[PDB]
Symmetry: C2
Subunit: 189 residues, 2 copies
């Protein structure tokens, strides 16, 4: 097995994703070895997803010959599930990312959003607390919990957060459709 292939696979397993803008050489090594990486990850019940438009290589749980797996009972999964509040915040972040991406052209940039901008939009849904400090602490806690899943980054000195591109594959229209159907079933009974 080539050294580059093994190093790229190990790094991707360690971090969960590979981005060309950060690790271009590893991205090139892994992109040209789709069959090799697939063969390596087949015994481990894992699969590789490629987005050359966004230059992202991610690892997902391989779908076996089982009708229902819940995608969280896999032994190597350590993340916790997502509740409704986190899902709503992720949907808001995805809308903001869509807005950022639509008016985007050639060049390198990042999706940065301030907390104060997100404050009223989430206040519309959750409600309003007595003090601004309480709402700010709630937002900080939610952002920290979501950063524990690798979706955002730590807050900067100017009260901003950066949205990772993986949400695009997290909020793909298929998963959005499944979540919408589940929510419709939950509300209606």
């Amino acid at each position: 097995t080539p050294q580059r292939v093994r190093e790229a696979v190990q790094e991707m397993l360690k971090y969960g994703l590979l981005e060309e803008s950060h690790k271009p050489n590893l991205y090139r090594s892994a992109l040209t070895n789709i069959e090799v990486v697939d063969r390596i990850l087949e015994p481990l019940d894992l699969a590789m997803g490629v987005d050359e438009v966004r230059g992202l290589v991610f690892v997902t749980v391989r779908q076996g010959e089982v009708a229902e797996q819940d995608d969280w009972s896999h032994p190597l999964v350590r993340r916790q599930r997502l509740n409704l509040e986190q899902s709503l915040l992720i949907a808001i972040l995805r809308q903001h990312f869509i807005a950022y991406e639509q008016e985007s052209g050639t060049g390198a940039s990042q999706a940065l959003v301030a907390v104060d901008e997100l404050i009223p939009q989430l206040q519309v849904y959750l409600g309003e607390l007595g003090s601004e400090a309480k709402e700010r602490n709630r937002i900080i806690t939610l952002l920290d919990q979501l950063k524990g899943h690798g979706l955002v980054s730590a807050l900067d000195a100017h009260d901003r957060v950066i949205i990772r591109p993986i949400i695009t594959h997290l909020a793909n229209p298929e998963n959005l459709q499944a979540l919408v159907v589940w929510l419709r079933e939950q509300v209606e009974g």
Copy 2:
């Protein structure tokens, strides 16, 4: 690749060790397929060590 061999490899890579007293099936599958385990773990730069005195199957960084 046999399903039992894949299950034993997954368990060994997850928990880092295999005991016959706890998982006799996986221990027997890996013990009788040492060459298969070595071939599987070679691309991962890993090797399997067996201590049949205590039925202990562990992983070492081959180099």
